[PDB]
Amino acid sequence: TTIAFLGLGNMGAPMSANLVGAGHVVRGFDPAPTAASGAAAHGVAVFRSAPEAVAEADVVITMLPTGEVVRRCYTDVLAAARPATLFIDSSTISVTDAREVHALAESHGMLQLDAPVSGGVKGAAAATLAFMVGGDESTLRRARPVLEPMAGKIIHCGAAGAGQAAKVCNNMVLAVQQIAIAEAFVLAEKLGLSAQSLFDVITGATGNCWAVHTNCPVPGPVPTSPANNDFKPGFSTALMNKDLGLAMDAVAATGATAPLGSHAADIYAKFAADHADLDFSAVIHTLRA
Amino acid sequence: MTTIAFLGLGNMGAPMSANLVGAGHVVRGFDPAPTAASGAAAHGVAVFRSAPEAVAEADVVITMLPTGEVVRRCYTDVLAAARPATLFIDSSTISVTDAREVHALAESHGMLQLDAPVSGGVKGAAAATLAFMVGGDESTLRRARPVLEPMAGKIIHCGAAGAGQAAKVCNNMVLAVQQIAIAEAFVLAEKLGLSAQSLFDVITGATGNCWAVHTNCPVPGPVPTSPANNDFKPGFSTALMNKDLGLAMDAVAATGATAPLGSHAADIYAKFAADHADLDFSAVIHTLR
Numbered sequence: 001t002t003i004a005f006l007g008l009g010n011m012g013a014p015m016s017a018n019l020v021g022a023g024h025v026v027r028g029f030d031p032a033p034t035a036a037s038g039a040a041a042h043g044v045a046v047f048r049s050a051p052e053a054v055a056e057a058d059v060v061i062t063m064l065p066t067g068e069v070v071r072r073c074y075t076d077v078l079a080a081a082r083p084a085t086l087f088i089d090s091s092t093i094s095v096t097d098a099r100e101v102h103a104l105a106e107s108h109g110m111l112q113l114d115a116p117v118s119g120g121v122k123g124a125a126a127a128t129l130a131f132m133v134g135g136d137e138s139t140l141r142r143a144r145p146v147l148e149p150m151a152g153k154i155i156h157c158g159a160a161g162a163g164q165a166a167k168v169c170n171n172m173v174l175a176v177q178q179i180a181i182a183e184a185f186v187l188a189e190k191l192g193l194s195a196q197s198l199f200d201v202i203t204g205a206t207g208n209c210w211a212v213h214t215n216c217p218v219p220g221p222v223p224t225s226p227a228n229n230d231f232k233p234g235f236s237t238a239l240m241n242k243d244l245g246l247a248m249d250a251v252a253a254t255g256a257t258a259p260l261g262s263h264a265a266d267i268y269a270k271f272a273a274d275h276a277d278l279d280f281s282a283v284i285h286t287l288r289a
Numbered sequence: 290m291t292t293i294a295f296l297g298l299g300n301m302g303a304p305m306s307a308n309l310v311g312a313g314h315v316v317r318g319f320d321p322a323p324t325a326a327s328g329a330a331a332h333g334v335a336v337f338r339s340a341p342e343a344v345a346e347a348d349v350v351i352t353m354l355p356t357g358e359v360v361r362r363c364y365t366d367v368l369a370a371a372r373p374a375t376l377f378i379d380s381s382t383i384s385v386t387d388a389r390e391v392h393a394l395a396e397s398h399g400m401l402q403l404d405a406p407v408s409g410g411v412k413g414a415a416a417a418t419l420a421f422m423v424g425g426d427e428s429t430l431r432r433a434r435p436v437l438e439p440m441a442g443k444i445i446h447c448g449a450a451g452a453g454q455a456a457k458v459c460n461n462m463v464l465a466v467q468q469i470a471i472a473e474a475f476v477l478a479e480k481l482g483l484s485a486q487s488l489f490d491v492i493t494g495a496t497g498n499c500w501a502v503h504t505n506c507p508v509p510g511p512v513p514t515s516p517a518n519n520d521f522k523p524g525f526s527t528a529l530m531n532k533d534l535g536l537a538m539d540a541v542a543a544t545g546a547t548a549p550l551g552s553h554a555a556d557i558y559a560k561f562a563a564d565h566a567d568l569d570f571s572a573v574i575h576t577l578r
């Protein structure tokens with residue numbers, strides 16, 4: 001399988017290295033020389049333009065920052081692709097942009113999936129990413145052998161756009177929980193209830209969630225959590241702020257009522273103005289702002 | 290086998306007291322609602338004419354009462370009647386401030402005292418699977434264990450007087466926020482065209498998982514035992530969640546803490562309780578459609 005990998009940044013570089021490692025021929029493009037060089041260093045044949053990379057590919061993967069850039073990439077390469085090429089967008093973009101690029105690709109006789117990922121740079125390097133997939137079941141089946149060497153988990157969420165919608169709904173919940181857990185720790189501390197006690201109760205009770213059992217925002221109860229390491233990501237406030245922006249786009253596009261999700265989004269946008277580089281659990285310290 | 294006075298023989302007290310009788314304790318009951326008292330007598334509680342009489346010959350006094358004010362008043366009524374160094378356990382859910390006040394009052398009368406509020410509701414009470422979250426001295430809890438075990442699935446020592454109440458109220462605030470957030474996610478998914486089943490599968494397999502979805506799923510289908518499938522019959526009523534959120538807001542106000550989402554969830558539940566006090570708190574999903 002020949003794969004064109006368009007977007008060889010912090011996530012795209014290690015993903016493409018895993019594809020090389022699993023015996024694929026990987027062709028690449030990235031407009032940053034340092035990204036492109038690094039990728040070429042791990043066996044990717046790097047081209048000057050995206051249409052060139054796409055020319056001989058059976059699979060085209062995108063990992064790009066915004067739906068506008070994904071859309072532009074598609075209209076730039078689709079005429080250069082061979083018919084029935086499999087396009088997989090693993091960018092995190094709005095559900096609307098997802099469905100539009102899906103329709104665009106299929107109108108050219110291509111097969112297309114949205115497959116955004118959770119797990120970060122660490123997961124990308126370790127080939128444990130979670131792919132949340134929208135599109136036809138039979139297209140996902142064809143894609144499976146390409147996704148497997150990058151992935152710890154592959155979930156079919158529904159029709160085109162469903163992968164984006166699933167990830168955005170999960171991350172909106174996550175942001176709310178990380179804030180709620182932080183509020184609970186600071187309340188407990190003011191009430192004279194130790195962090196370890198609150199942790200022991202909440203993790204054995206209805207309030208338990210990853211935000212506490214793994215990402216506990218106070219040092220001590222979970223020695224590996226970012227709070228014990230100067231809030232080094234982990235999952236950065238910058239990235240969380242990006243997902244919540246998308247969640248607010250989806251809320252605006254649908255007219256949905258999302259009071260706590262929107263409030264979380266407000267909170268994280270403000271926090272990202274100061275602390276974008278810290279793990280999102282660091283929000284515990286911006287509560288008095 | 291000791292003698293226990295049980296003051297408050299209502300929805301929670303009646304089944305609690307029945308388990309104490311079944312374990313071989315002599316249980317001396319008082320409740321001024323004759324209906325509650327009658328029901329408790331039927332399961333073997335010896336019912337007295339007055340709270341001071343029930344407590345006069347008890348090693349342990351348990352209160353399971355509606356509010357801090359009622360607990361305070363009850364203590365004021367009975368403490369001088371109890372024998373010196375009688376062990377008072379308050380399993381009512383009351384403010385942390387109220388707990389500390391009643392605790393100090395009990396001790397100024399020469400009584401041992403714990404706060405031991407519970408989770409599990411009436412089904413937990415009947416089955417003797419309640420979780421007791423205990424504040425007070427470790428040695429008093431040691432003295433109390435034989436009495437709490439027949440009623441309990443879990444007994445956890447949370448810290449000094451008031452810490453049981455604190456732990457509960459912190460957990461329940463988180464829970465209220467999670468239940469709204471999950472509701473928001475499911476409604477947003479529906480608007481995006483992502484199925485409830487698929488959102489369920491994703492969130493429960495991802496970082497957003499929590500009891501509010503995996504057990505209390507607010508859409509019918511994915512968890513057939515959740516209230517959504519049984520006309521939102523509680524479960525954990527909106528009336529009770531609204532009470533616990535009032536207590537959290539008392540704690541927030543007493544401490545000067547900042548709890549944006551917890552307070553926003555308090556406002557949401559206070560509004561929903563005006564008309565849907567009788568519905569499971571997962572029914573708040575209704576306000577988002």
Ligand SMILES: NC(=O)c1ccc[n+]([C@@H]2O[C@H](COP(=O)([O-])OP(=O)(O)OC[C@H]3O[C@@H](n4cnc5c(N)ncnc54)[C@H](O)[C@@H]3O)[C@@H](O)[C@H]2O)c1
Binds near residue numbers: 298
């Ligand atoms: N019901 C639940 O599902 C649940 C779950 C967890 C915790 N709780 C908490 O348990 C406590 C009791 O709940 P409940 O559902 O049994 O309430 P309830 O109203 O059914 O019972 C309270 C009982 O106390 C009696 N009472 C009032 N004043 C009294 C006095 N001075 N002496 C003796 N008895 C008196 C009332 O007459 C009543 O029968 C509350 O603080 C509640 O928040 C309830």
Ligand SMILES: C[C@@H](CCC(=O)O)C(=O)O
Binds near residue numbers: 127150151
């Ligand atoms: C096992 C996994 C793909 C194989 C892998 O990359 O670990 C999956 O199918 O979810």
Ligand SMILES: C[C@@H](CCC(=O)O)C(=O)O
Binds near residue numbers: 417418438440443444
């Ligand atoms: C909660 C108690 C067990 C009593 C029971 O199983 O009912 C204990 O293990 O301490």
